[PDB]
Amino acid sequence: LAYSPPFYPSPWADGQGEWAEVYKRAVDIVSQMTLTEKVNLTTGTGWQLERCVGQTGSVPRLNIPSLCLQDSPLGIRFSDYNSAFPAGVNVAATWDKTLAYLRGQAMGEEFSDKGIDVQLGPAAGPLGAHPDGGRNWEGFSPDPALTGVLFAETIKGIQDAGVIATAKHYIMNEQEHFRQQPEAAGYGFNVSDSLSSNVDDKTMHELYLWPFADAVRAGVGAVMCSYNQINNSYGCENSETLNKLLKAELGFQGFVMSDWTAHHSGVGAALAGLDMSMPGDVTFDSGTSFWGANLTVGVLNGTIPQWRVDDMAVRIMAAYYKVGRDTKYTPPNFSSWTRDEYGFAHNHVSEGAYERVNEFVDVQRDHADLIRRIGAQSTVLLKNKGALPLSRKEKLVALLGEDAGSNSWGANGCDDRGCDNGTLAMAWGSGTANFPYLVTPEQAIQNEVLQGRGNVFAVTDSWALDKIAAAARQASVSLVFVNSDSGEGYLSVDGNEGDRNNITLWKNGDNVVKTAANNCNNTVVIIHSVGPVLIDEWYDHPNVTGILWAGLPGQESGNSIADVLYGRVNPGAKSPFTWGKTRESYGSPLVKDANNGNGAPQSDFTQGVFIDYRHFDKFNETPIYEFGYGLSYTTFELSDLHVQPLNASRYTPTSGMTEAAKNFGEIGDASEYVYPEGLERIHEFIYPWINSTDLKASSDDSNYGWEDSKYIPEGATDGSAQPRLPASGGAGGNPGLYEDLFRVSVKVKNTGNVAGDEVPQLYVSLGGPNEPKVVLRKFERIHLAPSQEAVWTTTLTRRDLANWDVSAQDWTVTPYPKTIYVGNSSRKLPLQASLPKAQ
Amino acid sequence: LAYSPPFYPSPWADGQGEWAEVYKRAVDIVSQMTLTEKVNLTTGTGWQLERCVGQTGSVPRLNIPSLCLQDSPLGIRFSDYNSAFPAGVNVAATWDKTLAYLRGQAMGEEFSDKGIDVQLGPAAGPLGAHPDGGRNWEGFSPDPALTGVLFAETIKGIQDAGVIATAKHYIMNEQEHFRQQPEAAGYGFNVSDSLSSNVDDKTMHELYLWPFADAVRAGVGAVMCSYNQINNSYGCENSETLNKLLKAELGFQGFVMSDWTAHHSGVGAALAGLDMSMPGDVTFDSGTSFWGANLTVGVLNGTIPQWRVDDMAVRIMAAYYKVGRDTKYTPPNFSSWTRDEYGFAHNHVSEGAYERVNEFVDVQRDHADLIRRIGAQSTVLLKNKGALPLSRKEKLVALLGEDAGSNSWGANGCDDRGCDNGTLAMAWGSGTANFPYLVTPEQAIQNEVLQGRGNVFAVTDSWALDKIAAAARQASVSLVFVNSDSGEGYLSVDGNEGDRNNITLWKNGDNVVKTAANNCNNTVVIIHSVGPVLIDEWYDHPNVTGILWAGLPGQESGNSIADVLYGRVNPGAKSPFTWGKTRESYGSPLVKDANNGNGAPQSDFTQGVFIDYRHFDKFNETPIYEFGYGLSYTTFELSDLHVQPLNASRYTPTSGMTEAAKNFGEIGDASEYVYPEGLERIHEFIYPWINSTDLKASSDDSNYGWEDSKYIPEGATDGSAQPRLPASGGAGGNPGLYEDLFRVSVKVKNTGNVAGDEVPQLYVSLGGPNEPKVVLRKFERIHLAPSQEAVWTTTLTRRDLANWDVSAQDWTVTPYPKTIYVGNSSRKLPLQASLPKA
């Protein structure tokens, strides 16, 4: 079995870089706290007991309210009068830093105005090793460079609006199957623990960890550790990933929270680098916690050093201050658990005051315009044989497919969006929000047509192929809408247990396209989907005159696609993943079977860095549509590639020592931390207090009281100055990684008759034997008027040209010659240059 | 068994009234025709053989093209790039002469531009004796006066746009069950003929015939005779209804066509007053006809007098000339049978040229605006507890019910509209058109809300009561859409064989309302339906703050209802029928069982004139919402009723004689009418020519050749001058009926704060025993600004105050005292006056 070696102690915060002032303030206030006040910040109060999906204990003596933590990465979950933004995969499709930032800002505004302190997003894990992975859509792209940039901008936008962002899921949660033992049980498997993702150190650094470095460098306040194991150590107690990679190497100064029921042990997790238990209980509404009283006891009995729990509270408070939450705080003004105006303060048990739990605060502002715009700008034009844009003089339009129409249960009619009924604007699970409304394609396009003389019919039963054919036969243009859905592992839709069982269109989609294309010579296909689908059977049909991929656009879906189809927006999105001929062209099969007996199933990441386009390139598979590809209503030309070497400082591997750990504040006698007698204990609520000064009894852990060496690795309680890792030194790693080595410029010209955007892309060949032919490094979306030329300049950093050396435990720019390729897809790379050796 | 007495001969045209010039011209051209040319005009060419649902033969020698006849009363059937207008029942709900006319004009323009010569509409039969009758919605109202006025205006509009209108279905086709023997067979009944409607002479005159008098007086070109029997004599060979009532009494100068396969015999129909056989064959694609060669033979063998077939051609050509079709003619530029560009000229057999059969001509003009308007103006506000109009600042709107949503097969996805899927904008059968598009309530209201900050959810599964409740709970206002559907007898939807099996909301509708009202304190209910529904289970729920009936609004449905709900239009429609507590409150049960053994089922019209509100009034049944009732966003008051007796000419019962019948043109030897040698005969096509000069063989009728007295009533071939009937004398009867006897005026005032329309109504009590307490006679829709007053002046004619006297066979103003009642519904009649004797 794969083994995750120990890395201890859990590094303590030090106010490095831009965290200096908030670290000082965090220390100042945590120094004033009692042990139980500190424990309160670290532990949620239990599932469904307050307003938000996660809520910490409060520190009322110091005027610190409970931190409210709320899903999702695309909008506020379980609320009202809020917006539903396009999914993260759409943002990836924009290839646009500014739209990622703006979306982050707009989301942060809405979260803030509902009284939410922590947004549980954005996501770069799963990255997207498996195209059928159920949650890839919540993130960005399988490409680490593209994902990292847009992850970071999203984080900056959320945090500039005064809400803590949470980089999730850290790390290697690349599939839903077996992510949780009780879920697997409920699906009829018998396994003793969650799936283990087994991955080598090079691949970890060069692929899966890379976007998390970006998040740390961008100043992200929190990281959410994952449900799965890595090398058979749970995400929320993996000392290698949390202590060594995230904290020691990347220099992360904020706090690690668990995914919901991803916390498995009190002492183990705390020493392995967890900082916050959510939603606080052992299991939902168990009325027990791995922390709470257990964390109080674990400190009181001398096992968990005071400096470790102090560090947790310093990290949490530093983040809270870093986004200015102390100045922006407002109390939650909604409830996650009901839409009623009135209800019990503690919903799961019907206790506390019966009070106004929803104030119905309109937080939407004008964010609808931004959502519409991102929807248009994330629409990838894959094929256009002079079909588009439409004129609005078409004699008859046919709108075809269930994906054009309405969810007859309402936009929010399926809990957690757990269905594929009507237009697919949002995929399923906890990465969801309630729609304030949903504009369907049927609605938007009919409205467009009815401004002129056009006739229009909408056939939204995908199983009525006779009716689809008949409408298609009469039409000047047939607009076919189709979809493929997936989601979080706890929710099964038509037997798809989060992960999608195939990558074929749902709801008879291939047959809708074929029936339409057989009856209409001008058939345009629009795909709403969580990721790539198989299009081999119909994409080159001579009647399929248009193909677009529109992802999961949120509330303005219809309007976003109409804008593109009628030419108000000239599409300029590029594919953020590869469109292959078969499922098998992708490699990386999901682990769908209990492949380790009754033990934890094992998923070995033997593909290494060769996922998505890197796999296709290595195995010489030809994509139908490649990573980075998309069309436009104009044409562009790239020319005049130049490389400017920059006078850069040398890389200095980091050396020396940290400071020794510090205790902040004092801990007294066990008696100080017993429950106050007049406090009415709410049932199932998780408090920091102990029942009595009997510590064994107050914990109730039937294995309580062993000597440390029986169950705690060496060094886990060592508070001395520790060595600095060579690849450490700053936020996101050694600052020498982010030294600029080269400026690379290229001319981009709009050679056609319509204004539009191009996405020029810079790929590098790092050189040497089992390195990918190309990996993406830089890109930009540039708007050009007809005939306009602009020179695009980007930079290559040391890190962009480096490889992870497992022996040095450092990033190294290898002696192999490096070559750059510039173009407008991962396969349309007409320009190139050999780079000189960099300093 | 009820018996229909003989009335013969079939009266011949005489260019009466406004028909004088076109009669002259018709005679002139028919005089030039050979027998087979004449027969060609009288007989369709067979089902699915040419472009239109009906097409006559042509007269190419005289440059007369084939007459193209097309459904429906609400828009062109089986075509493209056309409009779908609101149904006739919506027109009735407007109570607006002008909207009826304008809709007629708009329809006529579209029919004309497709190359259609005859619109198969409008309808006043079924009138609406049975609230569950499947086709009442195609017509106007069970009230004859309201129906007659709006029937007539519709006819005038169609004909002023240059298309022949067809007054249908004549007469007593009050239900779909058993209307046709083969339909009944297909539904598992064994009956030897169609249902017979048995109805007394008084009731016929005072109720069912009345709107047809209006049609005739309005100059209607054609009448379609019905599938049913009247007193056990088929509609298309009933000598009493066609010869005596329509032709002799009402003076009808145009032509009678059969409903499609309603023609039952060659000689019998011709002498009983039929003028045109549609679609021309005995049964669909039989390749035989009751006329065609049989009519040629029936003349050649001396049975059917020449004057009878000449008269048929005169009546047909006179109608064609009356609307100016000779100047407006354009060839049909579409096909009923396919939407493909190219196809065979003769669709059913794939013969003739393979040619362009659809030219896709856009005939819609700007008619969409008129459709949206009529939709708004036909929406009856039944209840409003300060819910309406909406502001567009409502925080969250819930749209609830399948009737709010889309037909997922497309607007035209069910053949002949034979389903109740998504919003109900058009009911089913032949009275249908293809939508150019359909705006759903979901679409229009979401669009409205999205102009502001309102959140909005649409739950359009009427079975997902949990989802309905949840959305309703969150809403500031819940807009519940519900429906009830019906249609023509040939098509069964969910076991409803045209006629609806009950008058309860379809698709779980009562439950949708209740679920919504239990969860939302501001629930507005919008009903789209063919006619009245039962609302007793929720109408007075304290959370039902609004109730509207929007009928069948056609293509702009969503926009029409949004206009009303958001107050761009202040609703002023009144109910054109009664909303009762139970089905039983209406009386008039349908005949749903083979009630006469294996014979023709019998339906006796024992209720007489007492249908709809007249029944309620007689049996002291209290309607939930009465005939003529509707609310508005303002209030009105009526006052100062005055009655002025007028200096009227006396009624003179008509006397004297007609002219004797005339032959127009000559008939030669049988050999002149044999098929021409070189003519390629299209299979199944109905031609006027005979196979040979052997007449018996050319007919092939296995009972051919009896002496007349064995199977033809006395007088049926009598061409002598005939007596004029006392109640005859002009178009729609004796012109003394239309003399004004009283001028009646009343003041109407808008006493509220919004501009709006009121519909003042004048009812009369004709007096005597077994007469209704009140019957509607006059009405008008009047627009008033807040505080504005206007005086409405109308008249009462002799006919308005008369009764049909079975002994005199005449209309008589009886000596019983008459009283008038003025108000704004059939029960809100605060003003009254006894009339002096005229």
Ligand SMILES: *[C@@H]1O[C@H](CO)[C@@H](O[C@@H]2O[C@H](CO)[C@@H](O[C@@H]3O[C@H](CO[C@H]4O[C@H](CO[C@H]5O[C@H](CO)[C@@H](O)[C@H](O)[C@@H]5O[C@H]5O[C@H](CO)[C@@H](O)[C@H](O)[C@@H]5O)[C@@H](O)[C@H](O[C@H]5O[C@H](CO)[C@@H](O)[C@H](O)[C@@H]5O[C@H]5O[C@H](CO)[C@@H](O)[C@H](O)[C@@H]5O)[C@@H]4O)[C@@H](O)[C@H](O[C@H]4O[C@H](CO)[C@@H](O)[C@H](O)[C@@H]4O[C@H]4O[C@H](CO)[C@@H](O)[C@H](O)[C@@H]4O[C@H]4O[C@H](CO)[C@@H](O)[C@H](O)[C@@H]4O)[C@@H]3O)[C@H](O)[C@H]2NC(C)=O)[C@H](O)[C@H]1NC(C)=O
């Ligand atoms: C103060 O106070 C406090 C509070 O109050 C307290 O505390 C307490 O304490 C106690 C003691 O005393 C405890 O208990 C314990 O615990 C433990 C732990 O757990 C956790 O973790 C795990 C893992 O581990 C690992 O890791 C970590 C981190 O993460 C660390 O820490 C450790 O040390 C380790 O390490 C290792 O490895 C790594 C990698 O991975 C590396 O790196 C290093 O170096 C090393 O090597 C896990 O597993 C767990 O989990 C589980 O559980 C949970 C709950 O908690 C859940 O949730 C999950 O799911 C899971 O489950 C599963 O499994 C189980 C079992 O366990 C079952 O049952 C189920 O069913 C399933 O399947 C966690 O998380 C532990 O371990 C322990 O236990 C043990 O013992 C018992 C008794 O007998 C049994 O039963 C079990 O089984 C076990 O066993 C084991 O061991 C033994 C000895 O010890 C042996 O014999 C056996 O064989 C086994 O072994 C195996 O395994 C191991 C591990 O892995 C290895 O090592 C080996 O090799 C083999 O393979 C107990 O339980 C508790 O916890 C606490 N509490 C709290 C609340 O905190 C104290 O005490 C006080 N003090 C005074 C003085 O007073």
Ligand SMILES: *[C@@H]1O[C@H](CO)[C@@H](O[C@@H]2O[C@H](CO)[C@@H](O[C@@H]3O[C@H](CO[C@H]4O[C@H](CO[C@H]5O[C@H](CO)[C@@H](O)[C@H](O)[C@@H]5O[C@H]5O[C@H](CO)[C@@H](O)[C@H](O)[C@@H]5O)[C@@H](O)[C@H](O[C@H]5O[C@H](CO)[C@@H](O)[C@H](O)[C@@H]5O[C@H]5O[C@H](CO)[C@@H](O)[C@H](O)[C@@H]5O)[C@@H]4O)[C@@H](O)[C@H](O[C@H]4O[C@H](CO)[C@@H](O)[C@H](O)[C@@H]4O[C@H]4O[C@H](CO)[C@@H](O)[C@H](O)[C@@H]4O[C@H]4O[C@H](CO)[C@@H](O)[C@H](O)[C@@H]4O)[C@@H]3O)[C@H](O)[C@H]2NC(C)=O)[C@H](O)[C@H]1NC(C)=O
């Ligand atoms: C020239 O040419 C031409 C052409 O080509 C020709 O013609 C022809 O002719 C033939 C003869 O010959 C014919 O046939 C015949 O016909 C008849 C008629 O039919 C129809 O109608 C009916 C009714 O009737 C009624 O009405 C009318 C009017 O509307 C009239 O016209 C008549 O006359 C009558 O009358 C009566 O009544 C009324 C009331 O209603 C009154 O008003 C009066 O006064 C009187 O009384 C009907 O019914 C029919 O119908 C049926 O048919 C159809 C087909 O067509 C169908 O669609 C329907 O549905 C029905 O059916 C049912 O029925 C049947 C039976 O009929 C069966 O089969 C089935 O299944 C079902 O159920 C029509 O519309 C007829 O009638 C005839 O028949 C007869 O006879 C046979 C043999 O014998 C038998 O079978 C039958 O049954 C019958 O019988 C009867 O009658 C007889 C005498 O006539 C007697 O004897 C017996 O007994 C019986 O009786 C009974 O019944 C009746 C009835 O109603 C009564 O009346 C009694 O009383 C009793 O009860 C035959 O068929 C044909 O049509 C023709 N064709 C064409 C194309 O046009 C000619 O011929 C030529 N000419 C030369 C010289 O050559």
Ligand SMILES: *[C@@H]1O[C@H](CO)[C@@H](O[C@@H]2O[C@H](CO)[C@@H](O[C@@H]3O[C@H](CO[C@H]4O[C@H](CO[C@H]5O[C@H](CO)[C@@H](O)[C@H](O)[C@@H]5O[C@H]5O[C@H](CO)[C@@H](O)[C@H](O)[C@@H]5O)[C@@H](O)[C@H](O)[C@@H]4O)[C@@H](O)[C@H](O)[C@@H]3O)[C@H](O)[C@H]2NC(C)=O)[C@H](O)[C@H]1NC(C)=O
């Ligand atoms: C990849 O992964 C996806 C997702 O898991 C897999 O998709 C799933 O594939 C299975 C297997 O094919 C599907 O189950 C099938 O669903 C069929 C359709 O079910 C729906 O429609 C039924 C019938 O609906 C028609 O008829 C009714 C009444 O007769 C009408 O109301 C309705 O409007 C329809 O009318 C049409 O058809 C009738 C004739 O039947 C005509 O007369 C009409 O004119 C008109 O043309 C209905 O009963 C049912 O309740 C459904 O609503 C079903 O027939 C078949 O037996 C089977 O159950 C899943 O639905 C599908 N799920 C998803 C999410 O797509 C996919 O298979 C997989 N691919 C591969 C290659 O592994």
Ligand SMILES: *[C@@H]1O[C@H](CO)[C@@H](O[C@@H]2O[C@H](CO)[C@@H](O[C@@H]3O[C@H](CO)[C@@H](O)[C@H](O)[C@@H]3O)[C@H](O)[C@H]2NC(C)=O)[C@H](O)[C@H]1NC(C)=O
């Ligand atoms: C302190 O943390 C410990 C865990 O380290 C908590 O003890 C654990 O509490 C859970 C209840 O949430 C126990 O689960 C129960 O186990 C029985 C055993 O068969 C099972 O039948 C129940 O369905 C349930 O799974 C678990 O056994 C227990 N673990 C041990 C080793 O004692 C404890 O509750 C925490 N204390 C506080 C104050 O929250």
Ligand SMILES: [Cl-]
């Ligand atoms: Cl919710």
Ligand SMILES: [Cl-]
């Ligand atoms: Cl059609």
Ligand SMILES: [Mg+2]
């Ligand atoms: Mg191929």
Ligand SMILES: [Mg+2]
């Ligand atoms: Mg226990």
